[PDB]
């Protein structure tokens, strides 16, 4: 099996995607893999913590050009991995690879968009009728989806989770007592994380997006304080920059899709947290 | 601006 | 058929009377099973006609019958060889048709005088006034052998049959005679290339066919070497400028292509009387191809440059041209230029180069076509030789630090390649000092692909310096990144001795390298532990087997223990593949 694992791999490498009875194997042992993770999955770092990637396949190459190839770097991708990109399936299947070949070199986050609702509005599902011929490995990725880990916790100070914060949820323990198994709500405390986003008003606010909401600067600082946390990471918001800061610092958005949906003209972003929690970040451009 | 669900 | 000879033919196949092709070349020997007198009488005149297109084997016959002088009776029966050759002569397959003047051509020597005139030549009128073209085509080839050796009255007959050949009803004859005026040229006496060589070329030389004038300028370069001084002015410099000016661009592209032999051919005084003006013509040329064939001459041209007022006329009527072609839009025109231009250091001086090719060197060094830059530096010789080490280390190190150290990181990808150029051409003593620093700094780069790419780089640095210098400028500074906290950097380490194993030799790296190899099996983070696994089983075969015996099969063991799945994972497949399992 490793051995034709790291076939796969090279064939995906090449932007090649794999058959769907490959997907549909690769899927069943990533759940194995996946449902003894929790909601609040444990990150030791080194590692290096990736934003939205969105199907843009040749941009995720060129952000391992960046910060090493797997295994020998670490990664924690805060979800996103399809829909908008033109190449989805590649992407999430070759992420999903990694994460069952290197259980313990790859952690993988759930974003809103690794949802069957959205992926059959934003392009994963077309996709794949597109590539395969039926929605055969839709089902299988969007059933997988339901088993990726909602936050990630890096050396019990680094709060990583694809979205933000949640009014009806102030603890860790909070997140942990959720059951993730299941589709993306519309409203709750596992919609918001894959949904909010800080903003510059103080408190709570309307989410102009529909779902979740806006937190300003003594929210985050409330939760930080409440759990120990050093810093909360999350990603979800395209940041002209590639990355971004804000709550005094309480908060940092990462963005790893440059030029996004090939119109937006953003950096992309990736940030490196070392063998001493010391965070740096990596801005690149979008690959030839 | 690609449409509020998100440039 | 019969057998002395039978043994040529392949009566295997379903052919034409085809020949055994690897018998063809056992030929000289069936040459013997009959005698000289059998091989005239039945031999050739079984070659001559029974010639079925087997090409590889109409050519490796034709290459025999160049060495058959001797098997037919020597000097006195060599025209016994004429008629199989006449035939091959005119085939379809150039290569073929080739082959058998080179032979003609061969045996032509072979011929006594008297056997020219009574053999040869005829053969020669028979294919230049042939029916068919090859045949015309061919005979081009065979009028300077013949020309020499034969009566004066035989000469005049061979001058006019070559002159009806240069104005033949079509355009290849008249190519094929073209590209033979000059060896013709060559062999007739003064007087004749006066009275009847140059109306051919001036003729030629205003062909309405352009493929055919193009093929002048070489044969105007021959005209010119045999003529003194004085006739070429009238005779030829007006056909010459002309075609420097001719309509066609392919006609003045050659004429810049075979510029340094005209330049040679006329002299000195036409070449600062005509030539010059010309250069700068073709190098203003609108068509990319002449001012880059043209470029691609400069330094070469200034270098014969009578020494009398060369320096002079380089300051004067060329380097303004060329500053011009620094920024040509073409970079198919800066690049010619790029791959010779400081080449002319030499002749204008350490301090004519330090105030005028100094600065272009820098503006090309800086241009956009990553091409153009490689030209540069891939010649710098010649420009530190004539400055100092530290005139021009003064002059490019800005450069190249400046862009070492980028916003881009490909861009800094791109310096990092010059470097084992850099570093063979302007010597070890100068990289140790000025260079080595820029390579230890891109190792520990942010990007990971800049650290690999200096990584793999240092190897082609040891192949640059030898084992020695690596074990003492870098070895040491490389071995120094084991205690970097960061691990990003730890892994650097192992993966600059995996390359530098490749190229240290056994000693060196058992010594050195695999020391910090081992000691770093016990590293916190498993990252680093799984990837000295890998480097124990890339640096393995180039240890001794002691060595693989006495401390890596212990290391590896004892990390098959280890907790972290993909460290066990890798330690057994590292003993696995050493054998040390
Ligand atoms: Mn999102
Ligand atoms: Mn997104």
Redesign the pocket.
């Given at each position: 099996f490793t051995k034709e694992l790291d076939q796969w791999i090279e064939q995906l490498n090449e932007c090649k995607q794999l058959s769907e009875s490959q997907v549909k194997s690769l899927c069943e042992k990533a759940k194995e893999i996946l449902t003894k993770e929790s909601n609040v999955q444990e990150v030791r770092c080194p590692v290096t913590v990736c934003?939205?990637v969105?199907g843009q396949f040749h941009d995720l190459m060129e952000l391992f050009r960046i910060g090493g190839k797997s295994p020998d770097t670490n990664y924690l991708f805060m979800?996103?991995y399809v829909?908008?990109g033109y190449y989805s399936v590649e992407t999430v299947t070759l992420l999903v690879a990694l994460k069952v070949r290197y259980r313990e070199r790859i952690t993988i986050l759930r974003?809103?968009?690794e949802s069957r609702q959205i992926t059959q509005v934003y392009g994963f599902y077309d996709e794949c009728l597109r590539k395969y011929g039926n929605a055969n490995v839709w089902k299988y990725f969007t059933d997988l989806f339901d088993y990726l880990p909602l936050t990630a916790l890096v050396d019990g100070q680094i709060f990583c989770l694809?979205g933000g914060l949640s009014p009806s949820i102030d603890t860790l323990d909070h997140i942990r007592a959720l059951d993730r198994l299941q589709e993306v709500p519309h409203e709750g405390p596992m919609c918001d994380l894959l949904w909010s986003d800080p903003d510059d008003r103080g408190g709570w606010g309307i989410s102009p997006r529909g779902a979740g909401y806006t937190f300003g600067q003594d929210i985050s600082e409330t939760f930080n304080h409440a759990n120990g946390l050093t810093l909360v990471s999350r990603?979800?918001?395209?940041v002209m920059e590639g990355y971004n800061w804000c709550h005094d610092r309480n908060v940092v958005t990462i963005?790893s899709?440059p030029n996004?949906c090939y119109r937006c003209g953003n950096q992309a972003a990736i940030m490196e947290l070392d063998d001493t929690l010391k965070y740096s970040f990596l801005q690149f451009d979008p690959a030839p | 601006x690609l449409x509020r669900x998100x440039x | 058929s019969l057998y002395p000879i039978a043994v040529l033919i392949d009566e295997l196949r379903n052919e034409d009377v085809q020949l055994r092709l690897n018998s063809i070349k056992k030929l000289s020997t069936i040459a013997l099973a009959l005698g000289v007198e059998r091989t005239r009488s039945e031999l050739l005149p079984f070659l001559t006609d029974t010639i079925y297109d087997e090409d590889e084997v109409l050519l490796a016959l034709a290459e025999q019958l160049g060495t058959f002088t001797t098997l037919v009776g020597g000097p006195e029966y060599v025209h016994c060889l004429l008629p199989p050759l006449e035939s091959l002569a005119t085939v379809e397959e150039t290569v073929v048709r080739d082959k058998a003047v080179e032979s003609l051509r061969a045996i032509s020597h072979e011929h006594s005088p008297s056997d020219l005139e009574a053999h040869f030549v005829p053969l020669v009128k028979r294919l230049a006034g042939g029916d068919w073209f090859t045949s015309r085509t061919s005979a081009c080839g065979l009028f300077s052998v013949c020309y020499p050796r034969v009566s004066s009255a035989v000469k005049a007959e061979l001058r006019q049959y070559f002159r009806n050949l240069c104005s033949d009803d079509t355009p290849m004859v008249r190519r094929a005679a073209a590209s033979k005026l000059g060896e013709f040229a060559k062999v007739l006496e003064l007087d004749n290339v006066k009275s009847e060589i140059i109306p051919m070329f001036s003729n030629l030389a205003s062909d309405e066919q352009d493929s055919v004038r193009l093929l002048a300028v070489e044969a105007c370069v021959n005209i010119a070497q045999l003529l003194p001084q004085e006739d070429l002015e009238a005779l030829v410099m007006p056909t010459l400028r002309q075609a420097a000016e001719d309509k066609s661009w392919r006609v003045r592209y050659m004429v810049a292509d075979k510029f340094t032999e005209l330049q040679k051919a006329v002299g000195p005084e036409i070449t600062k009387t005509d030539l010059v003006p010309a250069f700068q013509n073709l190098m203003k040329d609108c068509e990319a191809e002449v001012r880059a064939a043209a470029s691609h001459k400069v330094k070469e041209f200034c270098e014969n440059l009578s020494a009398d007022c060369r320096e002079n006329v380089i300051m004067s009527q060329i380097l303004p041209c060329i500053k011009e072609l620094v920024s040509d839009a073409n970079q198919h025109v800066k690049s010619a230029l790029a791959s010779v231009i400081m080449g002319l250091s030499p002749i204008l001086g350490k301090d004519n180069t330090i105030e005028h090719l100094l600065p272009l060197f820098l503006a090309q060094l800086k241009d956009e076509c990553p091409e153009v830059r490689l030209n540069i530096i891939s010649n710098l010789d010649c420009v530190n030789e004539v400055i100092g080490i530290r005139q021009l280390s003064q002059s490019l190190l800005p450069a190249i630090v400046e862009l070492a150290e980028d916003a881009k990181w490909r861009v800094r990808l791109a310096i990092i390649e010059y470097m084992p150029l850099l570093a063979g051409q302007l010597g070890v003593e100068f990289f140790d000092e000025k260079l080595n620093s820029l390579c230890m700094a891109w190792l520990v780069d942010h990007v990971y692909a800049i650290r690999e790419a200096a990584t793999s780089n240092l190897k082609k640095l040891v192949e640059k310096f030898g084992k020695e210098w690596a074990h003492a400028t870098i070895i040491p500074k490389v071995l120094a990144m084991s205690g970097d906290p960061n691990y990003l950097h730890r892994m650097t380490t192992l993966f600059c001795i995996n390359v530098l194993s490749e190229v240290c030799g056994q000693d060196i790296t058992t010594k050195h390298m695999l020391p910090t190899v081992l000691r770093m099996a016990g590293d916190p983070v498993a990252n680093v532990r799984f990837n000295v696994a890998k480097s124990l089983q890339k640096i393995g075969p180039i240890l001794d087997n002691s060595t693989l015996q006495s401390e890596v099969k212990p290391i590896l063991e004892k990390l098959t223990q280890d907790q972290d799945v993909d460290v066990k994972y890798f330690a057994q497949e590292a003993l696995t593949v050493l054998s040390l399992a």
């Amino acid at each position: 099996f490793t051995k034709e694992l790291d076939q796969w791999i090279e064939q995906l490498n090449e932007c090649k995607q794999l058959s769907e009875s490959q997907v549909k194997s690769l899927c069943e042992k990533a759940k194995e893999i996946l449902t003894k993770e929790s909601n609040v999955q444990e990150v030791r770092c080194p590692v290096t913590v990736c934003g939205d990637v969105h199907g843009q396949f040749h941009d995720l190459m060129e952000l391992f050009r960046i910060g090493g190839k797997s295994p020998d770097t670490n990664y924690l991708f805060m979800g996103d991995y399809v829909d908008r990109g033109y190449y989805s399936v590649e992407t999430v299947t070759l992420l999903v690879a990694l994460k069952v070949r290197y259980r313990e070199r790859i952690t993988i986050l759930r974003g809103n968009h690794e949802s069957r609702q959205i992926t059959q509005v934003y392009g994963f599902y077309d996709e794949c009728l597109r590539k395969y011929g039926n929605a055969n490995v839709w089902k299988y990725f969007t059933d997988l989806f339901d088993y990726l880990p909602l936050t990630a916790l890096v050396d019990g100070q680094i709060f990583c989770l694809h979205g933000g914060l949640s009014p009806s949820i102030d603890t860790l323990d909070h997140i942990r007592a959720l059951d993730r198994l299941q589709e993306v709500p519309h409203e709750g405390p596992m919609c918001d994380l894959l949904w909010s986003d800080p903003d510059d008003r103080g408190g709570w606010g309307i989410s102009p997006r529909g779902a979740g909401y806006t937190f300003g600067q003594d929210i985050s600082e409330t939760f930080n304080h409440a759990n120990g946390l050093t810093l909360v990471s999350r990603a979800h918001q395209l940041v002209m920059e590639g990355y971004n800061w804000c709550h005094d610092r309480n908060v940092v958005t990462i963005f790893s899709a440059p030029n996004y949906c090939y119109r937006c003209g953003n950096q992309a972003a990736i940030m490196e947290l070392d063998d001493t929690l010391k965070y740096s970040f990596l801005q690149f451009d979008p690959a030839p | 601006x690609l449409x509020r669900x998100x440039x | 058929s019969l057998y002395p000879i039978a043994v040529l033919i392949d009566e295997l196949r379903n052919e034409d009377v085809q020949l055994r092709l690897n018998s063809i070349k056992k030929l000289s020997t069936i040459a013997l099973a009959l005698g000289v007198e059998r091989t005239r009488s039945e031999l050739l005149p079984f070659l001559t006609d029974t010639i079925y297109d087997e090409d590889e084997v109409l050519l490796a016959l034709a290459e025999q019958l160049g060495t058959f002088t001797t098997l037919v009776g020597g000097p006195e029966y060599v025209h016994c060889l004429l008629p199989p050759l006449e035939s091959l002569a005119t085939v379809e397959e150039t290569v073929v048709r080739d082959k058998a003047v080179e032979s003609l051509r061969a045996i032509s020597h072979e011929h006594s005088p008297s056997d020219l005139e009574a053999h040869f030549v005829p053969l020669v009128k028979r294919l230049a006034g042939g029916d068919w073209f090859t045949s015309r085509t061919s005979a081009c080839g065979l009028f300077s052998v013949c020309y020499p050796r034969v009566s004066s009255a035989v000469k005049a007959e061979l001058r006019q049959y070559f002159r009806n050949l240069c104005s033949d009803d079509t355009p290849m004859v008249r190519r094929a005679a073209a590209s033979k005026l000059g060896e013709f040229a060559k062999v007739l006496e003064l007087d004749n290339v006066k009275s009847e060589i140059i109306p051919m070329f001036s003729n030629l030389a205003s062909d309405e066919q352009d493929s055919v004038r193009l093929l002048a300028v070489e044969a105007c370069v021959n005209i010119a070497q045999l003529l003194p001084q004085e006739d070429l002015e009238a005779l030829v410099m007006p056909t010459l400028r002309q075609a420097a000016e001719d309509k066609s661009w392919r006609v003045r592209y050659m004429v810049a292509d075979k510029f340094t032999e005209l330049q040679k051919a006329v002299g000195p005084e036409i070449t600062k009387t005509d030539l010059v003006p010309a250069f700068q013509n073709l190098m203003k040329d609108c068509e990319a191809e002449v001012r880059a064939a043209a470029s691609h001459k400069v330094k070469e041209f200034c270098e014969n440059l009578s020494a009398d007022c060369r320096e002079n006329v380089i300051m004067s009527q060329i380097l303004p041209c060329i500053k011009e072609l620094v920024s040509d839009a073409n970079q198919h025109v800066k690049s010619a230029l790029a791959s010779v231009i400081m080449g002319l250091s030499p002749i204008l001086g350490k301090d004519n180069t330090i105030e005028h090719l100094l600065p272009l060197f820098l503006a090309q060094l800086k241009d956009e076509c990553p091409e153009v830059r490689l030209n540069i530096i891939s010649n710098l010789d010649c420009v530190n030789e004539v400055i100092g080490i530290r005139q021009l280390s003064q002059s490019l190190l800005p450069a190249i630090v400046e862009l070492a150290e980028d916003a881009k990181w490909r861009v800094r990808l791109a310096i990092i390649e010059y470097m084992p150029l850099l570093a063979g051409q302007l010597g070890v003593e100068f990289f140790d000092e000025k260079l080595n620093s820029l390579c230890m700094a891109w190792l520990v780069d942010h990007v990971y692909a800049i650290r690999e790419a200096a990584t793999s780089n240092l190897k082609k640095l040891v192949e640059k310096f030898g084992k020695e210098w690596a074990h003492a400028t870098i070895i040491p500074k490389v071995l120094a990144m084991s205690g970097d906290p960061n691990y990003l950097h730890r892994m650097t380490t192992l993966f600059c001795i995996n390359v530098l194993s490749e190229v240290c030799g056994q000693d060196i790296t058992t010594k050195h390298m695999l020391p910090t190899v081992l000691r770093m099996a016990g590293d916190p983070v498993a990252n680093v532990r799984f990837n000295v696994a890998k480097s124990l089983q890339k640096i393995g075969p180039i240890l001794d087997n002691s060595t693989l015996q006495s401390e890596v099969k212990p290391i590896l063991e004892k990390l098959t223990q280890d907790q972290d799945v993909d460290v066990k994972y890798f330690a057994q497949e590292a003993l696995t593949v050493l054998s040390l399992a």
